[PDB]
């Protein structure tokens, strides 16, 4: 009725702070893993060159 309640009350703030920090850490890790992938596609000039070769030019 008295002792364990008081010590739980004492515990509450530090646990709240640590869990807030943990959530911020999770969000930070989520953000840090984001990279824009630029893709590379076959240049059309080689297609234009193969087209010309096929013509026997």
């Amino acid at each position: 009725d008295i002792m364990v309640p008081s010590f739980v009350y004492n515990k509450l703030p530090v646990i709240h702070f640590l869990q807030e920090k943990r959530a911020e850490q999770k969000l930070r890790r989520v953000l840090d893993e984001t990279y824009t992938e630029w893709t590379e596609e076959l240049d059309q000039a080689h297609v234009t060159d193969a087209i010309t070769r096929s013509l026997n030019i």
């Binding site: 076959l42 240049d43 080689h46 060159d49 193969a50 070769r53 096929s54």
Partner: protein, 268 residues
């Protein structure tokens, strides 16, 4: 009963009709004449274009049909022919040089080109050994575009020829063409890498000599005759009939071709 297979590759309908009339009038109907797009034996191909299924493009100077201008000449021109795909698809001779620039992998194409060049080089060295020459002349177009197909062609042809024990002399296209048309007695065996210019050079030599029939060695193993003009097609048909086992008819066709080039069908 028998069958002659006519392949059409860029030939005007007049030439094909003339060939059909010649075979019908000479053979007399004993051997049928069917038309197709690919064959391995008993086949005549008409037109400058290269048919599908041929790997070597040998041509010689037959003694009987020697023009008076080129009397006594003896030089064998062998053109290496890479496998031919459909007209729409990219040909190997161009893929092997464009894919490398584009960065695409070129392993299977290199393997196929290597096999074709090995077969062509084997044919060329066989011809050279039969004729007795010691050195053969490789012909490669020196354009910057063809900086990979010709490199592989040299690397393989010289390798095979040296393995056989003969010498190779590399040269460009213009110089060899001029030498072949002007002073051909100084060349015994000339191999040609697979390019359009080399095809034109082979046709020019086959025509200037007086009109001859070019032999094509196919993948299946065999020889098929090739012509592009009236006299050349007549000679090709004569050789084909000889192969089928007809001597008198072949001689008659050859004589008619010698006498009246453009109107052999009426001449005989």
């Amino acid at each position: 009963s028998k069958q002659l297979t006519f392949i059409s590759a860029g030939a005007t309908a007049a030439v094909l009709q003339s060939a059909s009339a010649i075979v019908s009038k000479v053979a007399g109907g004993r051997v049928q004449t069917k038309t197709a797009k690919e064959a391995g034996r008993h086949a005549v191909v008409v037109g400058p274009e290269t048919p599908i299924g041929v790997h070597t493009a040998v041509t010689e100077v037959p003694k009987s049909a020697q023009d008076p201008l080129f009397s006594g000449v003896s030089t064998v021109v062998v053109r290496a022919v890479l496998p031919r795909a459909a007209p729409d698809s990219v040909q190997l001779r161009d893929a092997l040089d464009v894919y490398a620039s584009a960065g695409i992998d070129t392993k299977e194409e290199v393997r196929s080109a290597t096999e074709a060049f090995k077969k062509s080089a084997e044919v060329a060295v066989g011809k050279a050994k039969a004729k007795g020459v010691k050195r053969i002349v490789l012909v490669v177009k020196q354009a910057s575009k063809h900086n990979c197909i010709n490199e592989l062609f040299k690397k393989i042809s010289t390798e095979t020829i040296e393995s056989a024990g003969l010498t190779t002399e590399v040269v460009g296209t213009a110089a060899v063409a001029n030498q072949l048309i002007v002073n051909p007695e100084s060349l015994g065996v000339v191999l040609l890498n697979d390019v359009a210019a080399t095809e034109q050079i082979e046709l020019a030599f086959a025509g200037v000599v007086g009109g001859v029939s070019r032999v094509y060695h196919t993948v299946e193993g065999g020889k098929i005759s090739a012509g592009h003009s009236f006299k050349s097609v007549a000679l090709a048909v004569a050789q084909e009939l000889r192969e089928l086992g007809l001597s008198s008819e072949a001689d008659k066709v050859e004589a008619a071709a010698s006498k009246n080039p453009r109107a052999v069908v009426s001449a005989l």
